[PDB]
Design a protein around this ligand. Structure first.
Ligand SMILES: CNc1ncnc2c1ncn2[C@@H]1O[C@H](CSCC[C@H](N)C(=O)O)[C@@H](O)[C@H]1O
Length: 328
């Protein structure tokens, strides 16, 4: 006993067992199904035209027959569209990036099928750098919009967790390669499934994504000193990392190339930094730090609007300080 959803591009259908499973208090397979049909209809206008006809809310997420009528109606619409693409009509353009709305849905879908037990992500040692927290989809979307990236860039999420930041960025930009490194076994284990599900679902919807690799590791290791030095865009949610880990990271960012950028939850250098005789070795001497705009309606436990910072390796700061020493 199941429910099947055909791929708009011919991949293997999506199969859901019945009763439909629940993911958490706010997500169940039944609504994922309804939402997937809704989004494929966004990708294919003709499909949307065939779906309107006769689907007057007459569906109960709790009735097998009712949900089966929804899936079959969608699947028959998919067959007609596929016939339509055999005639003169042009097929849905392939290998294109997903829209922001579709991406939100695809990542939620991948998460649903990968993080089977969300609770285990909380089995970390409190008050340690191991503290787990997820950056909202929207913040990453904002970062992507403000930090124009190109195929010349390399993106790294230090302490990537189950890897959803790397997947969103890989689906939205054309970096040469995206990387995510996570130390804890639990999030790293889920990242493996996250990776499989993402590739599977992106193929299912017929969407393209840049190259990316989710790996297990310690970003403070020797291998990572040079890896970090060659990254042009680094994302790091260091809110709970601590002064010791942040200090090490600074040593490593100090080797990055001109124009390199870092986005984080806690700034690595004060926003009011002013070079002088006492802080010549301070990280703030080689980087501009700006606070990204707070996303409207987005607060954290601190009651204030969630804050992220953008650092840009700019050694022109230090060079101007020395010139000022020479004149006068
Ligand atoms: C000290 N060396 C280390 N090496 C590798 N991972 C580490 C680490 N220290 C802490 N972490 C990891 O950084 C993550 C921060 S939560 C942000 C998730 C995602 N990025 C999100 O934004 O949504 C945790 O999962 C830690 O295990």
């Amino acid at each position: 006993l199941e429910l099947r959803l055909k791929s708009p591009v011919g991949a293997e259908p999506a199969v859901y067992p019945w009763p439909l499973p629940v993911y958490d208090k706010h997500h169940d397979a039944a609504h994922e199904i309804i939402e997937t049909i809704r989004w494929v209809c966004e990708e294919i206008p003709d499909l949307k035209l065939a779906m309107e006809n006769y689907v007057l809310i007459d569906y109960d997420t709790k009735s097998f027959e009712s949900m089966q009528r929804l899936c079959d109606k969608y699947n028959r619409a998919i067959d007609s569209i596929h016939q339509l693409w055999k005639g003169t009509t042009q097929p849905m353009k392939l290998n294109t990036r997903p829209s922001t709305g579709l991406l939100r849905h695809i990542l939620q879908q991948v998460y649903n099928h990968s993080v089977t037990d969300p609770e285990k992500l909380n089995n970390y040692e409190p008050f340690s750098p191991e503290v787990y927290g997820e950056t909202s989809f929207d913040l990453v979307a904002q970062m992507i919009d403000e930090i124009k990236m190109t195929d010349d860039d390399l993106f790294v999420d230090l302490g990537s967790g189950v890897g959803q930041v790397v997947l969103q960025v890989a689906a939205a930009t054309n970096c040469k390669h995206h990387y995510g490194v996570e130390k804890a076994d639990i999030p790293a284990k889920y990242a493996e499934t996250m990776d499989r599900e993402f590739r599977k679902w992106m193929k299912w919807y017929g969407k393209k994504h840049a190259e990316y690799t989710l790996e297990r590791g310690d970003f403070l290791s020797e291998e990572w000193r040079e890896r970090i030095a060659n990254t042009s865009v680094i994302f790091v949610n260091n809110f709970a990392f601590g002064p010791e880990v942040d200090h090490q990271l600074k040593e490593r960012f100090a080797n990055m190339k001109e124009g390199g950028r870092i986005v984080s939850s806690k700034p690595f250098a004060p926003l009011n930094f002013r070079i002088n005789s006492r802080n010549l070795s301070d990280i703030g001497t080689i980087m501009r730090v700006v606070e990204l705009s707070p996303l409207k309606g987005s607060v954290s436990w601190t009651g204030k609007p969630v804050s992220y910072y953008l650092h840009t390796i700019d050694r022109t700061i230090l060079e101007n300080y020395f010139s000022s020493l020479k004149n006068p």
